[PDB]
Amino acid sequence: GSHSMRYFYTAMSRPGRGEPRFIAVGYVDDTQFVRFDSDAASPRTEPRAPWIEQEGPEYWDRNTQIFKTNTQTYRESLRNLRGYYNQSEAGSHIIQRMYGCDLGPDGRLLRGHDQSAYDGKDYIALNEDLSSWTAADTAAQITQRKWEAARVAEQRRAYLEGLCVEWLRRYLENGKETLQRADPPKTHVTHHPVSDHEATLRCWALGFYPAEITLTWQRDGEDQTQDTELVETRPAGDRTFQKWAAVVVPSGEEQRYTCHVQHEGLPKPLTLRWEP
């Protein structure tokens, strides 16, 4: 199947409470495999999935040096952005960066990503060409100019097409029993009267990996988008995810409703009905 690696950096200032915290986590698809937290007693890169533990001390130390250096650089960056927005020293602010590479089913680079945000708003992003930037505003333009002058894009491109893909492939192979294993949802439909004349039908998907899933209700074969209550896909804590979709239907019309489930792990997409 298709796979991606992402690192997510969060740098959070907190004036009066020490230097900005920097935390990095790495994911392959929906599987976190590494973390670094500058607030840890002994900050260092720590494994968060079994298949990464086989990496050697050189690997851990390399990650750690990288994250330690980023920790310092992000603190400078927070200072810089505060200035770019004429903000006071009083407020807490956050820079986020998410970057990584997507492979297609053949393991070829599909595309790279390198996006940054400030206080939760798009700030600057590497375009799909991995060569040019999109700055959200005049502040980000300052970063863009600085990065254009330092030919940062070229660096990001080299990483995204090179190390990113190489390491992603390595992880995919090392953790193939899980990373390349799709676990289909376990499904059922529940029925709860909400009154004499309406009942809730809830379509459950449990235990599935990866998180990507489609869960829909149809009435007489028509999508019930607006009438469907669809909870956010949520982690079970055992690597798998859960989701449900609920519709309120006229009592007696239950059999006109079908739940449809699409998931990578399913031999065939599912159609379910309430089974009294």
Binding site: G26, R62, I66, L81
Partner: peptide
């Protein structure tokens, strides 16, 4: 593996 520290100075925002 995360993006490696460039030869020179890691460029801040």
């Amino acid at each position: 593996l995360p993006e490696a520290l460039p030869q020179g100075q890691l460029t801040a925002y």
